[PDB]
UniProtKB/TrEMBL annotation, chain A:
Portion held of the full protein: 638 to 686 of 882
The protein's assembly and partners: Homodecamer; each decamer is made up of two conformers of VP2, called VP2A and VP2B. Interacts with a VP1-VP3 complex. Interacts with the intermediate capsid protein VP6. Interacts with NSP5. Interacts (via N-terminus) with NSP2.
Modification note: Sumoylated with SUMO1 and SUMO2. Sumoylation of viral proteins seems to have a positive role on viral replication.
Protein name per Swiss-Prot or TrEMBL: Inner capsid protein VP2
Domain remark in the UniProt entry: The N-terminus binds RNA. It is necessary for encapsidation of VP1 and VP3. The N-termini of 10 VP2 molecules form a cylindrical hub underneath each 5-fold axis of the inner capsid.
Stated family: Belongs to the rotavirus VP2 family.
Superkingdom of this protein's organism: Viruses
Lineage of producing organism: Viruses, Riboviria, Orthornavirae, Duplornaviricota, Resentoviricetes
Function (record text): Inner capsid protein that self-assembles to form an icosahedral capsid with a T=2 symmetry, which consists of 120 copies of VP2, with channels at each of its five-fold vertices. This capsid constitutes the innermost concentric layer of the viral mature particle. It encapsidates the polymerase VP1, the capping enzyme VP3 and the genomic dsRNA, thereby defining the core.
Gene name tied to this protein: VP2
Localization terms from the record: Virion
């Protein structure tokens, strides 16, 4: 699975960026930056269940 | 002068065989899916996905 789609959805939902112009490398760097973050408590609990 | 005894010989060979040339049409080669194609170190060639 390639997460470029996930990052593109994230940027599109941010509502102020031009995802069509944001290149792929920036999106994958954003994915790397996101990967290090902890997961929200509720979402993590749902995933564990 | 023609001498029958000195001219009569017996030639020996094989009865039949088939000579092939391609030598690789007998090899059926497939390729793993390109996404999970590993390099010499046994890790995916492109691992930024």
């Amino acid at each position: 699975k390639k997460m470029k789609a996930i990052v593109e959805d994230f940027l599109k939902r941010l509502h102020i960026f031009d995802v069509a112009v944001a290149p792929d490398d920036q999106m994958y760097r954003l994915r790397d930056r996101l990967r290090l973050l902890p997961v929200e408590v509720r979402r993590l609990d749902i995933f564990n269940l | 002068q023609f001498d029958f005894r000195n001219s009569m010989h017996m030639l020996t060979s094989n009865l039949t065989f088939t000579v092939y040339s391609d030598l690789l049409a007998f090899v059926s080669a497939d390729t793993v899916e390109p996404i999970n194609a590993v390099a010499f170190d046994n890790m995916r060639i492109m691992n930024e996905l």
